[PDB]
Design a protein around this ligand. Sequence first.
Ligand SMILES: N=C(N)N[C@@H]1CCCCNC(=O)[C@H](CCCCN)NC(=O)[C@H](CCCCN)NC(=O)[C@@H](Cc2ccccc2)CNC(=O)CNC(=O)CNC1=O
Lengths: 38, 154
Amino acid sequence: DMYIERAGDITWEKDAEVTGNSPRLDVALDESGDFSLV
Amino acid sequence: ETTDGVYRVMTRRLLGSTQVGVGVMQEGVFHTMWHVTKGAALRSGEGRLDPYWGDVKQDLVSYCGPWKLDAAWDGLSEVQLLAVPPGERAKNIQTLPGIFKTKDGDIGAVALDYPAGTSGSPILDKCGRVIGLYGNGVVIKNGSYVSAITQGKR
Ligand SMILES: N=C(N)N[C@@H]1CCCCNC(=O)[C@H](CCCCN)NC(=O)[C@H](CCCCN)NC(=O)[C@@H](Cc2ccccc2)CNC(=O)CNC(=O)CNC1=O
């Protein structure tokens, strides 16, 4: 039996750290909701 | 009756209290990913949240009402992942999305890696609008995880 607990407001943060790449990938989405790399 | 914001999805059915995911309460409706709840009812304090819409292929589900989130990445700007990792305070991470190119068209993707129970964390534009949810993705050649920006239909 699952339950939910509040964790924060949904707001943009001005001081936020910036990280992560921006890859451009060919993918396929199957009937089961799973992505795979083509 | 239940406040807007980001929420952990917890279960006590396993060892201890376990965070299986995350979701968004907006306009009276709770939004998360299908693989987090498998469409199960949720409790919110004393009250019960009943599934209303879901789709395994999109990997989304909404509770109490229809999917309400309709903002989309503009294809140009940085976004913020509001990551809510198990046992850890909510943290915003800014990033420029990559792209999942599919037969049915292109969607944004964010190349940020977090524990499985982080599934459902919202991705925001500079106006604070949720442009989709984190956690349905792939692992690419160099072993890194990349998640679709998964958004529903309003
Ligand atoms: N470096 C990583 N592997 N990072 C991931 C980051 C997870 C972020 C939240 N998302 C999820 O939990 C979804 C659930 C399933 C939703 C499906 N529709 N998940 C995922 O998308 C990924 C990708 C699935 C591709 C399907 N074509 N699924 C996983 O990793 C699996 C392992 C796996 C890797 C590659 C291919 C297939 C399966 C579970 N993970 C592990 O076994 C070890 N990693 C962790 O235990 C923490 N990190 C991680 O689990």
